[PDB]
Amino acid sequence: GQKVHPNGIRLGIVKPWNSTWFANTKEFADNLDSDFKVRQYLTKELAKASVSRIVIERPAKSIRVTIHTARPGIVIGKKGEDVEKLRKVVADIAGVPAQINIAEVRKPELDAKLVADSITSQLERRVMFRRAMKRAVQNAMRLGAKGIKVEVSGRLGGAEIARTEWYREGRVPLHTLRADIDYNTSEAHTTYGVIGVKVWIFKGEILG
Amino acid sequence: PRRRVIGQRKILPDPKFGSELLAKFVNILMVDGKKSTAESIVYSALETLAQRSGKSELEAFEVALENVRPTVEVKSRRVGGSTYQVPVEVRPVRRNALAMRWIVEAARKRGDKSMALRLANELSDAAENKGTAVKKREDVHRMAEANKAFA
Amino acid sequence: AKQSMKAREVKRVALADKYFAKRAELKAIISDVNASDEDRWNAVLKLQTLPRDSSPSRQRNRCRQTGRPHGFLRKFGLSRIKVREAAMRGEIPGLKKASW
RNA sequence: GGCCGCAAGGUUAAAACUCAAAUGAAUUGACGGGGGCCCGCACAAGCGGUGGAGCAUGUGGUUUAAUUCGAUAACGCGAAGAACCUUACCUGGUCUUGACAUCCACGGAAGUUUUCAGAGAUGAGAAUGUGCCUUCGGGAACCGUGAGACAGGUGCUGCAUGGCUGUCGUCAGCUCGUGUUGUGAAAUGUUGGGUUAAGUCCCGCAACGAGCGCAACCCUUAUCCUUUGUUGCCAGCGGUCCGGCCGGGAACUCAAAGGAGACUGCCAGUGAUAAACUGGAGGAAGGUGGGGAUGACGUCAAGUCAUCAUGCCCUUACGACCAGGGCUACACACGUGCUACAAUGGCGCAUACAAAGAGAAGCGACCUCGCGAGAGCAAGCGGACCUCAUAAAGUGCGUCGUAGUCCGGAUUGGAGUCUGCAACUCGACUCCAUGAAGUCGGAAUCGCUAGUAAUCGUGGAUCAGAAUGCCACGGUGAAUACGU
RNA sequence: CGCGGGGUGGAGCAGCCGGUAGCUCGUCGGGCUCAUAACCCGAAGGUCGUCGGUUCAAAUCCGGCCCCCGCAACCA
Helix, strand or coil, X not given: CCCCCHHHHCXXXXXXXXXXXXXXXXXXXXXXXHHHHHHHHHHHHCCCCCEEEEEEECCCCCEEEEEEECCHHHHHCCCCCHHHHHHHHHHHHHCCCEEEEEEECCCCCCCHHHHHHHHHHHHXXXXXXXXXXXXXXXXXXXXXXXXXXXEEECCXXXXXXXXXXXXXXXXXXXXXXXXXXXXXXXEEECCCCEEEEEEEEEEEECCC | CCCCCCCCCCCCCCCCCCCHHHHHHHHHHCECCEHHHHHHHHHHHXXXXXXXXXXXXXXXXXXXXXXXXXXXXXXXXXXXXXXXEEEEECCHHHHHHHHHHHXXXXXXXXXXXXXXXXXXXXXXXXXXXXXHHHHHHHHHHHHHHHCCCCC | CCHHHHHHHHHHHHHHHXXXXXXXXXXXXXXXXXXXXXXXXXXXXXXXXXXXXXXXXXXXXXXXXXXXXXXXXXXXXXXXXHHHHHHHHCCCCXXXXXXX
């Protein structure tokens, strides 16, 4: 289990946190649990909507969710009909006043998580994994990624002996802390088993 | 080591007499990083020794050391089927150390009661040219002599 | 862990929540040196009568996601494994890898 | 069989039977008790251990009703804590759409209190309530019953998998594109001269470029400056209960936040007009300053289906509830630790100097009682304020005088304290008694190059309670490195 | 029947005077060993076939018996 998590190593420097609140040792665990719940719910709901990052932020006994999604139109539905619906359920989950914001993700080919999800979907609907991977890589490159890597693993083409294959393009420096490396993962629950998809997308280096 | 020789670290001289050698000796004596106790012991040894032989505290000690320093030690090359012990001229820094170590060992061995007293006794023996350290030195020399053919 | 175990834990917790006032009172009574012997005895017996799952020393801290009894942390309410994952994802606020 | 030969044998020369190869040259690796160059506590040089003892702890085995399952670069490992719980195991007692969900049907508001039997699980009683809305065939929360659809499984496969992890190894390597060479596997780049911690850098050169890694960016530590000074500080001022405690002061420590600083940048020599190396100047720091994080392509069908997820088997039981027991067994073997064997020490009395942490079902001063563990009372405090909380080794004075001891503390008896429904199996701690083995450990074997080893205490996590383990913190503080 | 060897540690070869009570491989134990064969250290296995006696030393010298050997001779 060689490698360090690319997001996790960079949280202090170039990457920010998702859950962004303060709490004392008393209420912290509970808060975490709540976050887990709400996030889980959101994932369940907005599966068909291309959702990248849920950012929870709770000040003053009131939860502020921020959903980063590629297509707001499906998440919002009719203007303030679906979002509103989501909100009350979120509140219920939390046990506090809820507030949902929806950030529009520019360039969903450069968002790593989204790409991974897409790949997983493709796998599920029985495409050639390799061709999917290629598409993922190519598209990102076209869009202006300084580099991208993707990796898929296990029961590829329903083969008895599992293996991993991966496509890199451009440069993807992981040891370099100041590199904006959007990393994320997904899992294709195929007929032969799970197929895990990792993808690293290098936006560029930050100078500060 | 393989790559790089390194400069020996700085050693402070002892507060009583202002000597590097003495400090080194004290350090050698010491166990479990209890320096202070060891130094006290050393001082005690010196004082008794001084009383015994006259002279000074330091001078006497030096004299004692002199009688247990080895001109030549041996090392195992073993290039052949059987091992050949080869003599080698032991350098100024090392020789002094070795003698001290031997003395300490002797002290440790000795059947007298207090450590300091034992040390003093050992020193006296060294000065006179009998005892354990001296014997060890002789043995070392003897071995070298035996293996003088190798050089 | 199993579902069943989790359920049991929940039940225990519920029991604890229920019977706290009474149990505590009983304990106090038992302790109180300035009290009758018979009363003390009664208290001791009374305690026995109450359900076992009512005790707080019965309930085990499990992970809030997986129910894993071992490797638990109190601040997060999560087992080590899950905690690490959370940290990696950015889901625990303030938590990052420490070096010194 | 013939011919030849003194003989040894030569010469001529089959067949059955049998295999799907056998071979040659070259290629990439791996290997060599081939060769060259180089590195690492690899050896050498040293210091301290392990192996002997007692105990702690894990494992093997054996035993058991059961001694849960896993790990076997496994064996103080998963387990950051098994009395019950945990618990997955055994023994009984019980349940079967079910402990956990969704769905209707229809009986009842949920829930609240209490009673006898039972080891308990459960099986039978007495009191209260009718809230959000009805062209009244009724509803959403929450109990009850029956049907099934289903739930459930720490059941099997890590040799179907994902994820996560170890490992060689923080080893300096591993590749690719285009070009060129070769019929081709492939080669070249990536080799060669130097150099470096480094496929580090330069120079050459059928290579030219690029990527992942060796470096840097990040945290921390070492010096300085600016800012801000309470709960932290007291240099100079006044007052004093001689306590920074109170006027105060913002200096210093300290606390964070932001900057500066180290780059072989400067000097000399060596070097191929070089990359570098050797020294010295300054400087708190010097050649990656010290430490951490960071683990390339890959390897081991390495580990984990018992965290989790996930592609045959059980479903009146391989599921669920309960009480008791077991996981703590004991001819024995191994692993890792602690404590010892003493005088560089033990005991007694006095007395000095830390850091880093934790704290609300929590940390708990002071005072009182108890020989003591603790008990009672009970402030201060979500905490630079209060509490845990006396640091210990050390230092001074006394004593013991080499004894199985005033060393050593196992073991066992008595009596008890606290936690907890509950300390029999099986907790910790206290007091009084008891006082094993052990006098430095066979073959062999481990760690460590500096604030390191060695030794001394302190804290934290898990946690009701339960560490000699683990993870942290400072104190004192060495030896040695000739060399390959 | 008579006469020469003597009778042992799982097997075997044990220093003229009766006081020495074994050595090889074997089994266990533990690290060497890339592996075992190891080298090396230590550990359990007796009666000395037996019955007696000379003597404090006895299996160890003798009287008989049971066997293993060897003997060479015999056989109506």
